[PDB]
Amino acid sequence: SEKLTFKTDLEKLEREKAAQIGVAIVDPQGEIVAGHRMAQRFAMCSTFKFPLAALVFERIDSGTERGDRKLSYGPDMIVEWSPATERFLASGHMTVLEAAQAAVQLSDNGATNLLLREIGGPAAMTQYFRKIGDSVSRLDRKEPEMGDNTPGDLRDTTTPIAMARTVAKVLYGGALTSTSTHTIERWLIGNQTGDATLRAGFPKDWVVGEKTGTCANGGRNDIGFFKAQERDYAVAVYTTAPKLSAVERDELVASVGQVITQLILSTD
Numbered sequence: 001s002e003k004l005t006f007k008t009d010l011e012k013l014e015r016e017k018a019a020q021i022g023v024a025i026v027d028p029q030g031e032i033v034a035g036h037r038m039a040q041r042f043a044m045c046s047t048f049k050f051p052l053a054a055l056v057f058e059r060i061d062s063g064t065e066r067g068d069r070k071l072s073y074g075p076d077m078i079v080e081w082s083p084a085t086e087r088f089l090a091s092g093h094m095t096v097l098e099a100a101q102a103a104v105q106l107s108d109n110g111a112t113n114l115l116l117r118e119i120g121g122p123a124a125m126t127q128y129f130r131k132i133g134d135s136v137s138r139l140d141r142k143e144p145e146m147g148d149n150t151p152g153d154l155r156d157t158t159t160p161i162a163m164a165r166t167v168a169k170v171l172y173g174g175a176l177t178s179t180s181t182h183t184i185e186r187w188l189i190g191n192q193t194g195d196a197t198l199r200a201g202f203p204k205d206w207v208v209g210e211k212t213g214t215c216a217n218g219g220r221n222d223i224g225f226f227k228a229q230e231r232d233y234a235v236a237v238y239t240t241a242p243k244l245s246a247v248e249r250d251e252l253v254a255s256v257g258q259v260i261t262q263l264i265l266s267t268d
């Protein structure tokens with residue numbers, strides 16, 4: 001059984017790395033391909049920035065937001081890990097689209113907060129999840145405190161299956177116009193923060209786009225999509241490994257990518 005091998009190999013990683021590994025792989029309609037701890041809650045950390053960009057694109061599509069609108073700010077908006085926001089600070093603004101692209105591709109925290117200050121805060125992010133049929137994911141705080149990942153805390157959490165289904169809805173389920181869908185996919189493919197994580201464990205000819213997270217208490221996450229030949233999949237990986245070094249956590253997620261690959265290749 002290929003799925004048994006998948007389970008066994010993930011459990012071996014968990015045992016040997018003292019880790020918990022949550023995975024869900026779904027088809028474009030949200031049908032389950034495979035998973036592990038798929039309905040256990042994990043901190044979303046920065047992975048929520050992909051749904052945040054989807055919310056922004058939905059508003060742009062609808063006309064309730066404009067991509068070129070300038071969002072002014074001062075140094076009050078700079079928080080830890082805000083590389084683009086810092087570079088644009090002297091100019092005094094970033095556009096909605098600039099901020100969204102920095103949030104997705106650099107995991108820029110200041111840019112994320114700038115967009116949260118606009119779209120209606122964590123309450124509004126959570127309402128977007130509900131609107132697209134995700135009753136599980138919840139944002140309660142802004143960056144970087146939303147990544148505190150206190151054990152057992154249900155604030156700022158999702159489950160692998162809820163998030164994978166949200167990704168599928170956004171990319172394949174008609175949440176966005178064809179243009180906006182294509183754009184967000186290109187942003188995920190061109191992500192600058194994921195070279196050592198999930199995509200490092202996939203075949204080099206798969207088209208892969210993803211959004212990473214790194215948070216306190218050993219959280220290391222990666223969500224997105226992959227196309228294996230003509231077959232599209234949405235995937236969410238959430239891991240907790242407090243005893244591993246940062247480099248080892250990257251390698252753990254890459255290893256999960258390999259386990260996913262073995263399953264997909266072996267099931268034809």
Ligand SMILES: *C(=O)[C@H]([C@@H](C)O)[C@H]1CC(SCCNC=N)=C(C(=O)O)N1
Pocket residue numbers: 044045046047081107109143144146147193211212213214215
């Ligand atoms: C998201 O998961 C966090 C946020 C909670 O702060 C950001 C920070 C990082 S890693 C920090 C070091 N980065 C570059 N030197 C990420 C990430 O995506 O890995 N997201």
Ligand code: NA
Pocket residue numbers: 073074075076077
């Ligand atoms: Na200020």
